[PDB]
């Protein structure tokens, strides 16, 4: 198999290879997944990569999807990359002319859900999107695609504040970073390094879910004694956004239980 997200397995069988011994952490580990098993019987490990957040949340994102979401059906989104890079040039310092690198990743991003929206049944869904999870250069391109629409909605959200309109929280504590203060330090120092020194950190994941207007519901097994065992991102969506479930042993990789 040439996937990128692991053939399924049984949960319970993934967790006594990974989790021996009896050891206070090998407990805490055990008791989050057997909390997980309660709803999902079987797990797809993610390549553990530094775009594993992204494989993993888009991943069930596009293996779920019935419908074409209005943020993809809007024309403005082709639009998008000329009217950033032409207004912001510090876009140009992307670590991937770029303009039609992206417009194409976008491209790319739209047909190929539009196309999973549309297939007659769910099982046809699950064949496209093994096929399309390859590690081959298109879905490296995908995650191209959600690391600009990452930047976008940190533009949107930066400006907002400074126009002193209301803005989410995660959004401040995003840029209280003193490596993120603003939108081009965001990309110099995190988006750029995403899929190529690291992965997303903790506030990102509220960044990402506002970039694909998606809920992820995560269990984070490092945390299970405490009220974080699950954390939503972000914390109040739209009722109208499609929930996505991971799994994150450390906040470093998710992979993904199903049902």
């Given at each position: 198999s040439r996937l990128s997200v692991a053939p399924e397995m049984d949960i319970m069988d993934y967790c006594k290879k990974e989790w021996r011994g009896n050891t206070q952490k090998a407990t805490c580990?055990?008791?989050?997944?057997?909390?997980?098993?309660?709803?999902?019987?079987?797990?797809?490990?993610?390549?553990?990569?530094?775009?594993?957040?992204?494989?993993?949340?888009?991943?069930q994102a596009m293996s779920q999807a019935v419908g074409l979401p209005p943020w993809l059906q809007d024309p403005e989104?082709?639009?998008?990359?000329?009217?950033?890079?032409?207004?912001?040039?510090?876009?140009?310092?992307?670590?991937?002319?770029?303009?039609?690198?992206?417009?194409?990743?976008?491209?790319?991003l739209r047909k190929k859900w539009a196309g999973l929206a549309e297939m007659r049944t769910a099982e046809a869904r699950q064949i496209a999107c093994d096929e399309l999870f390859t590690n081959e250069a298109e879905e490296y391109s995908l995650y191209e695609a959600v690391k600009f629409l990452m930047l976008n909605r940190a533009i949107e959200l930066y400006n907002d504040?400074?126009?002193?309109?209301?803005?989410?929280?995660?959004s401040v504590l995003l840029f209280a970073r003193d490596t993120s203060n603003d939108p081009g330090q965001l990309l110099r120092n995190h988006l750029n390094q995403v899929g190529h020194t690291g992965g997303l950190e903790q506030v990102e994941m509220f960044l990402l879910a506002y970039a694909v207007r998606h809920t992820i519901q995560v269990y984070r097994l490092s945390k299970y004694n405490t009220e974080?065992?699950?954390?939503?991102?972000?914390?109040?969506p739209p009722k109208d956004w499609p929930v996505v479930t991971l799994i994150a042993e450390d906040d470093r990789h998710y992979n993904i239980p199903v049902r």
């Open positions: 580990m055990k008791m989050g997944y057997e909390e997980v098993s309660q709803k999902f019987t079987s797990i797809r490990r993610v390549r553990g990569d530094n775009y594993c957040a992204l494989r993993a949340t888009l991943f989104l082709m639009l998008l990359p000329e009217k950033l890079i032409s207004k912001y040039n510090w876009i140009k310092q992307w670590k991937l002319d770029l303009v039609d690198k992206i417009k194409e990743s976008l491209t790319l504040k400074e126009k002193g309109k209301e803005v989410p929280f995660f974080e065992f699950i954390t939503v991102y972000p914390t109040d």
